[PDB]
Structure 1
């Protein structure tokens, strides 16, 4: 039905919001510290000197284990 199409769109958008803002391919699993922005996968977070969202200096990156993780890279 049309309701099925609406729910499919909601699911798609929620899943897309969990993807890295730089490569758009890998799940977000890294936090820039101390600002807290959690918007990148490990590879894209590795070489940024400043946060791509707020421009704060990145002192270090903290890996995050989220219950929503489903990709092979985060389960293996």
Structure 2
């Protein structure tokens, strides 16, 4: 409910779901999930969230 806690929550959402250090920076084609930072995207050939095979790793910019 508090501002700080809402904030902590959104920050935590932005984090790579594999290393949880760096922010997400890659979108998986073709499933379209935002899952990993750039480094961690080197370790995966299938989306961790939906297991779709990744045909391409697009770099993103907000």
Tell me, yes or no, whether TM beats 0.5: yes
Task: Provide the C-alpha distance between the structure 2 equivalents of 1:23 and 1:46, rounded to a whole number of angstroms.
Answer: 12
Q: With CA pairs under 8 Å and 6+ residues apart, which has the higher RCO, 1 or 2?
A: 2
- Residue 45 of structure 2 corresponds to residue 29 of structure 1: no
For structure 1, list consecutive stretches of 5 or more residues without a partner in the other structure: 67-76
Q: Deviations over 1:9-58 (max 9, x none)?
A: 00110111000000000010101111000111001112211100000001
Paired position in structure 1 for 2:14: 18
Q: How many aligned residue pairs are there?
A: 62
Q: CA RMSD in A?
A: 1.2
Deviating beyond 3 angstroms after TM superposition, the runs of 4 or more aligned structure 1 residues are none
For structure 2, list consecutive stretches of 5 or more residues without a partner in the other structure: none
* Greater share of helix: 1
Task: Provide the C-alpha distance between the structure 2 equivalents of 1:49 and 1:17, rounded to a whole number of angstroms.
Answer: 22
- Residue 48 of structure 2 corresponds to residue 62 of structure 1: no
Higher alpha-carbon Rg:
1
When normalised by structure 1's length, the TM-score is 0.77
